Design a protein around this ligand. Structure first.
Ligand SMILES: Nc1ncnc2c1ncn2[C@@H]1O[C@H](COP(=O)(O)OP(=O)(O)OP(O)(O)=S)[C@@H](O)[C@H]1O
Ligand SMILES: [Mn+2]
Length: 274
């Protein structure tokens, strides 16, 4: 009813400006006064925090937020919970990225140049490769979970926690999830940064999930100008319905992105349009 986010958490983190929000959390820039470090603190949203479902969900996700050490992955530093007069306010402390999500880039700027999109997604592949080698499937690859920093570094975040626009067909069906599910979802992001649109939209998540399972994506070159057939092949391989027909690893996907960036033919099956 009237929870508000305090100016200090746990007498160590002094909150500065609000950076963003999502369906659960509000993310603030903060100063870690103990380590003299600027950090991002993800706090359960004040307007949701007294709602038992949301509180409990936040706690279940905080204890599963994967802590990986890689230049393209947002580090997770700590978790905690502030006592306030309105009740407990749980939070996660993570690496601060001064930058913009791919969601916000596509919204405000439209599609990226193809070379830039290739570069960003190839860097995201490195993050995912590292995660997979450490036994962690991301599970929630989407444009909001990839940022480009002010120094043009790619940062992927929010790994390992178990919208419908970016789910893999196997997630839509409740089947087993593995590295190829992250490939598919990253293929959805690639599709969107190239064309300005996700592959599938609909009036409900049931309708969007149905499309992931049953309907072929419109080839990117048909959705938007300046896109090559070689890029169609790479994107549509990532988006193959059967996991066995996708890139089997994030590294394999990267290798094809690197070919296309260099004007070399990709290994992905050719796609013909008219
Ligand atoms: N480490 C970070 N550094 C800077 N900004 C961040 C960071 N993490 C998240 N943000 C921003 O905070 C927003 C909310 O992040 P999240 O709570 O993870 O929700 P989301 O990923 O946008 O969407 P949902 O809720 O998962 S659908 C992001 O969209 C960014 O705008
Ligand atoms: Mn996120």
């Amino acid at each position: 009813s009237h929870m508000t986010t305090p100016s200090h958490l746990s007498d160590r983190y002094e909150l500065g400006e609000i950076l963003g929000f999502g369906g659960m959390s509000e993310v603030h820039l903060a100063r870690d006064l103990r380590d003299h470090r600027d950090v991002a603190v993800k706090v359960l949203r004040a307007d949701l925090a007294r709602d038992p479902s949301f509180y409990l969900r936040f706690r279940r996700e905080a204890q599963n937020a994967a802590a990986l050490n890689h230049p393209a992955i947002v580090a997770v530093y700590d978790t905690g919970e502030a006592e306030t007069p309105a009740g407990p306010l749980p939070y996660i402390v993570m690496e601060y990225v001064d930058g913009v999500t791919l969601r916000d880039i596509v919204h405000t700027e439209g599609p990226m140049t193809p070379k830039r999109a290739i570069e960003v997604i190839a860097d995201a592949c490195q993050a995912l490769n590292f995660s997979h080698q450490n036994g962690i499937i991301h599970r929630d690859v989407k444009p909001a979970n990839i940022m480009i920093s002010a120094t043009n570094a790619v940062k992927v975040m929010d790994f390992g926690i178990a919208t419908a626009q970016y789910l893999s067909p196997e997630q839509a069906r409740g089947d087993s999830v593995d590295a190829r599910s992250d490939v598919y979802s990253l293929g959805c992001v690639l599709y969107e940064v190239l064309t300005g649109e996700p592959p599938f939209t609909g009036d409900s998540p049931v309708s969007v999930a149905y499309q992931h399972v049953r309907e072929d994506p419109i080839p990117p070159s048909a959705r938007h100008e300046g896109l090559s057939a070689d890029l169609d092949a790479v994107v549509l391989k990532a988006l193959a319905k059967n996991p066995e027909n996708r890139y089997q690893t994030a590294a394999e996907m990267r290798a094809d992105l690197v070919r296309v960036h260099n004007g070399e033919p990709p290994e992905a099956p050719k796609v013909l349009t008219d």
